[PDB]
Symmetry: D3
Subunit: 180 residues, 6 copies
C-alpha cells in the first residue's frame, strides 16, 4: 500500500518495521493497516500529527520489493517544528493500537482501496506479468492471487492482530531527514 | 468528481442525473465535493445505503462539466435479481434528504483532500494543465482552473451542505434504468 | 476501435478510404467497431494480408471515429516510395467492399471481441476512465451505451457483425483520399 | 504545444491571441514559437519574468480545440508581486519579437520538442485515431501528417513571421486572476 | 512476452513454468515468441485446448527474464468445480506436443508483430530505454537490448520451432496449483 | 537522468560507459545533471558534436544508479554507412574535454528544471513515491529520495563542472560497439 497525505495548508522523520512473510494473514493485515494509519486526513497519523501542528503531512508505505520487506511510516515537518516530538508522537501512535482498535469502517476503507488497485493490475497483462514475476521473486507465483483472497476474507481482528504484532519497538528503526 | 465503489465479492443499473450549477457559481465546488462524500468509498452515503442493505452491488457518482448542460450522475449496479425500484428510490432519497443527515466536517476534509490531490496531479503535468485551461475557457473563464482550487481550499461545511441541498432535489433529477435484456 | 499495423522490414505516401458510422444506439455500431479490428489490426487482418505480403503497402490502418459528426470509419494503407497508390487504394477498397463473398470467420470475431472487451475492462476498473466513457455516452445521447455496447459486444453473433460491415462498407458511402509528402 | 515552467525555488496574469486555421502555413510556426516563448528556463517569458521577480512561473499553450483557437500565455505570481507590471512585461515580450528575433538554436530545440511529441502520438494506435479525428475536425485528416512535414521544413524566417503577425495588440485579450484572500 | 486471455461470456488456477535459456543465447527470443503463439488471444494453442473443451475459463503465459533463473510460465484460470488434474495435464501436454503441431508462419508473424511493437514502445521512451539498457548490462552485455530486436527481426520458423521443443519439456518443468481456502 | 535524441549493417551503435560516484557522494547529482546537458535535445554536447557533422543520427545518455557499480552510459546511433571508430573517438573526446568547453549557467538551469519537473511528478503520486523510496532504501539510505532533490536545487555550476570533469576521464572509460 502507498499513502502520502499532505495538509492543504523540508525536514522529515520516519519509522520502519520489518514485514512478516509475504504469503501470511499478518502481511495482508499490515498492508491494510498501513492505509488506515497513513491514508487520508481520517488516518491515525494525520489526525495525530497535523491538526496538532507537529507535522505538515504524513505517509505510510509497505515495500515488499525490499529484502527484508519494510513498512515505512513518516511525516514531513515545516522548517521550525519539533523533530523529537514529531518522531515520538508518530511511533507512539503506531505502536499503541491495542489502546485504539481499528474500526470496521476503517478496515472497509482499506480493503476497498487495496482491491481497487489489484483489479486495475489484473485487467492489464503487462501489469499482471510484472506482479506474477514479483510473486516468483517473493518465492511463489500464487501469491498474486493468494493475497487478493486474504484481503477479501480479512476480518477486523486479523488486521488488528497483524499491526499490534508487528508495529512494536523491538521491530522499529527510526530516521530523520535534516537538510543543510 | 469521479467515484465508483463496489463490494468485495448482465448487470442491471439505476441512475439519477442532476444538472450542475454553472462552473462559475460559488455552489459548483460544493457539488463536486458533495458527489465524493456521497459516492466514494465504503463510507459514502450511497454505499452505506445500498450495499450492506443488499439493495445494490456497487455505487457511483460523477460530475461531468465537460457536458452542456453540466451533470452530476449517481448510480448503482445491481445483481440479476435485486429490486430495481427499491434501489432507485433509496438511491434518490439518500441524495435528496441531506437536510436530515447533514455532512460532517470529517466528510468534507475527506472530499477536499481527494479533490486537491487530483488538482495537484493535473497541475504538475503541462499537458493536463493545457487541457484544464482550455476547458475553463470553454466554460467562459480561463481563471476557473485556479479559482476552483481556491474555492475548494477555502470551502466551508455550511456552503457544501447548502449547495447539495439546493441542487439534489427531485425537480432537478432525471432517473435512468439499464436492464440487460 | 483503433488499429495501425506495420510490417517489420521522398517520404511515405498514404492512401485512404472513408466511410460513415451507424448511429451509436444502433446494433450495427458495434458490428462495425469489431469489423474494423478484423480488417485492420495485426498481420492476420484482411487489409494487412491483401496489401503487405503482396508488396502493395508498408502497413495498414483502421479507426472508428464517433467523436465526429458525422461519425466516420477510416481505413488506409501506408506506402513506400515507388508503390502504385491507385493499385493500393484499388485493392484496399475491393477488400473492404467485398466481404460479402469473403465472410468473417468465428475465430476472427473472437479475436476482435477479446480485444474490445479487454479495453472495456481496463476502462471500467478506473473511476477516471469510466467518468470519461460515461460523459461520451451521454454526449452520444444515452448514458446506457457505456454498458449496453459492452453487452452487445459480448453477445455479438457472426451474422450481425457480417451484415453490419456488409451494409456500411459500400462504394456509395465511400470517399477516397491520399497524402503525398512535400 | 504545451509549456509550463516554474522557478526551482495563487495570482495569475494571461494574454490570449487568436490562432490562424490549422491548414494555414502560419499555424505550425505559432506552435513552435509558443515553445520558444514559454518552455524551459531558456524561454523568452521565463527570462523576462522570473530572474526579475515578476513571476514564480510562466506558461504557453496553443489550444486548437477551441473555436476560436487560442494561443494562451501567462504568468503565475506570489501574492505581493505587481500584477500590472508582470502583465505589461508579458505582452511587451510577446509583441516585440521584431526587436529580439528567434535564433536557429531556439527553432531547433522547439522543433525537436514538436516532432518528439508527434512520434509519441504516432506510435500509439489510440492516440493516432484521436489525432486523425482532430485533423478531420480541424478541416482535413491529412493535416496530421502535413503539420509534421511543415514543422520538419520550418525555416527560422517563417516561424519569426508567423509569431510577429499574430502576437500583436489587435489580436490579444488580457486577464488577471486576483485571489479572494 | 505477456499474455492473459479470458472468455468473454474466488477461482482456482493450475500452471507450469520452464527455465529459459540465457537471455543472450539465440534460443532466448524463439521462446519469447513461442509463448505468444501459445498463450495470447483466442487463437492461441492453450486457449483452443482449454476453453472450448470447458477445461479452463482463461489462459496466460509470460516470459520473465528479470528472474534468476528466467522462466516462461503458462497457466489456466479455472472455475470452481472444473477438473484441475485434467486442465494441468492438457496444459502441460499442449506445451510439450508442439513437434506434432508445428508453428505456422502466420503464427510466427503474429508473434513477431507483437514483440516488435512492444520493443518500439520501449525505444520510444528514454526512461524505458534506460531501464532496458540497465537490464542488458546486468545480463553482462549492454548490446542485448538492440541484439534481441535484430534477432527477432531475423527469426526463422525452424529455429523458433526447435527452441520451443528443446525447452518446453517435462525435464524442465515445475508444476503448480492454486486452490482457494 | 535519461536522454535519447535523434535527428528527424542495420543500425550500429557505439557506447562509452563510466563508473558513477556513490549515490550519497556530493558528485552524484552533478553527473546526473551533466548527462542531461551532454545528451538531451539538439543543443546537447553530444548531439552537436556528432549529428550536424553527420557522424551519427542520434545520441543518448543515462545514469544508472540501480546497477552495482553505477554507470553513466553515453552513445550514438549511426546510419548503415558511417565510421564507428570516428563516432566513438568524437563521443569520447567531447565527454573527456569538458575543461575545454565548460557547462554554461543556462545549460545547468535547463538540466535542473528537467530534473526537478520529474521529481514533482513522482512526489505528486503516492504510488510513485513508494517505488522511489524503495530504490533509495536499496541504494542504502531512504533520505536520498529527498536529499538528492535538495542537492539538485542547490547545485552550483562550478560543482557540476567539476563532477563531470573528475569522472569523465580516460581511466574510467569502457568502450563498446554494436554491429549487427
Amino acid at each position: 500500500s502507498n499513502a502520502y497525505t499532505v495538509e492543504p495548508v523540508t525536514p522529515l522523520v520516519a519509522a520502519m518495521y520489518h514485514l512478516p512473510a509475504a504469503g501470511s494473514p499478518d502481511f495482508v493485515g499490515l498492508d491494510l493497516a498501513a492505509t488506515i494509519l497513513a491514508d487520508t486526513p481520517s488516518s491515525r497519523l494525520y489526525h495525530a500529527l497535523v491538526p496538532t501542528k507537529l507535522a505538515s503531512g504524513v505517509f505510510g508505505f509497505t515495500m515488499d520489493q525490499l529484502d527484508p520487506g519494510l513498512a515505512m511510516f513518516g511525516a514531513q515537518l515545516q522548517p521550525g517544528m519539533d523533530q523529537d516530538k514529531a518522531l515520538q508522537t508518530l511511533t507512539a501512535t503506531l505502536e499503541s493500537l491495542s489502546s485504539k482498535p481499528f474500526s470496521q469502517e476503517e478496515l472497509e476503507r482499506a480493503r476497498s482501496k487495496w482491491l481497487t488497485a489489484w483489479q486495475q493490475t489484473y485487467a492489464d497483462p503487462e501489469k499482471v506479468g510484472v506482479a506474477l514475476s514479483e510473486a516468483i521473486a517473493s518465492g511463489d507465483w500464487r501469491l498474486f492471487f493468494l493475497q487478493r483472497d486474504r484481503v477479501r476474507e480479512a476480518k477486523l481482528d486479523d488486521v488488528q492482530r497483524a499491526a499490534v504484532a508487528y508495529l512494536v519497538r523491538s521491530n522499529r528503526t527510526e530516521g530523520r531527514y535534516i537538510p543543510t
